[PDB]
Amino acid sequence: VDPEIELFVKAGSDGESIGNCPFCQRLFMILWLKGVKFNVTTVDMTPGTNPPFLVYNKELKTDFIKIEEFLEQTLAPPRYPHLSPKYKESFDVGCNLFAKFSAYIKNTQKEANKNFEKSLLKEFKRLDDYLNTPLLDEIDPDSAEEPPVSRRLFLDGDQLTLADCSLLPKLNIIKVAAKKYRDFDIPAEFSGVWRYLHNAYAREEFTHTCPEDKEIENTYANVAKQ
Numbered sequence: 001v002d003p004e005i006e007l008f009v010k011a012g013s014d015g016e017s018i019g020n021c022p023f024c025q026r027l028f029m030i031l032w033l034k035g036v037k038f039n040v041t042t043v044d045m046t047p048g049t050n051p052p053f054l055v056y057n058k059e060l061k062t063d064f065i066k067i068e069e070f071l072e073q074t075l076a077p078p079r080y081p082h083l084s085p086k087y088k089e090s091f092d093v094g095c096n097l098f099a100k101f102s103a104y105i106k107n108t109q110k111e112a113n114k115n116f117e118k119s120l121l122k123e124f125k126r127l128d129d130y131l132n133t134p135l136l137d138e139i140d141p142d143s144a145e146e147p148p149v150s151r152r153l154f155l156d157g158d159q160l161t162l163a164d165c166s167l168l169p170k171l172n173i174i175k176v177a178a179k180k181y182r183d184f185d186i187p188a189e190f191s192g193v194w195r196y197l198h199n200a201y202a203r204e205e206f207t208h209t210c211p212e213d214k215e216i217e218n219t220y221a222n223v224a225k226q
């Protein structure tokens with residue numbers, strides 16, 4: 001016995017596939033991690049406004065910040081898990097990452113590239129520090145002292161949370177778009193960032209909600225060319 005849920009997300013270039021839409025992917029991830037039954041319909045953007053929107057027991061919801069808080073609240077225990085993070089810093093971290101990428105990827109002045117890359121890099125470093133630094137709840141299993149490097153799987157702990165549902169779609173877009181148009185690789189030295197990405201891309205709830213890389217590339221084909 002579940003509620004009736006259809007999530008409407010943005011379609012990709014063929015009008016049917018999953019398109020590039022990080023807020024759509026965020027809600028898709030939330031619903032999957034809740035364990036609730038739901039259908040996903042893609043909307044060809046070539047009623048409401050832009051996706052995502054959601055129909056929940058026959059009622060249309062279009063304010064998508066409000067969709068997130070409604071799902072988290074509504075779909076509650078005992079039946080479904082709360083997905084909110086233990087620590088707020090799990091949200092706060094990376095809150096500026098996408099904006100720094102957005103400036104960098106649309107910069108058309110080759111001479112400013114180094115400065116824009118440095119600004120993106122400063123945010124990656126901040127995320128990396130959050131991910132390598134043990135959370136307050138972490139106890140090394142061999143020594144019972146606080147680990148010298150965090151080994152938790154995700155932002156907030158060993159389970160995917162709302163924080164991950166928000167950030168991972170943004171990280172995928174950055175990874176794909178920046179590589180294609182600026183030949184940028186997330187530095188290998190950001191060992192926490194990569195621990196997190198390898199763990200996340202190991203999860204079907206993340207990888208199978210990603211659009212094909214080409215969709216993301218198509219998004220930036222006209223803004224990211226210098």
Ligand SMILES: N[C@@H](CCC(=O)N[C@@H](CS)C(=O)NCC(=O)O)C(=O)O
Nearest residue numbers: 109111112113114115116117118119
């Ligand atoms: N800010 C520069 C010149 C290159 C540049 O455009 N940098 C950036 C990216 S961090 C910027 O905010 N541009 C200011 C502008 O709009 O001209 C420098 O350090 O010499």
Ligand SMILES: N[C@H](CCC(=O)N[C@@H](CS)C(=O)NCC(=O)O)C(=O)O
Nearest residue numbers: 016017018032038040041042208209
């Ligand atoms: N409308 C579908 C998108 C739906 C979709 O791709 N859902 C997949 C992700 S690839 C899924 O794993 N859904 C399982 C679930 O609802 O739990 C399409 O043909 O592109």
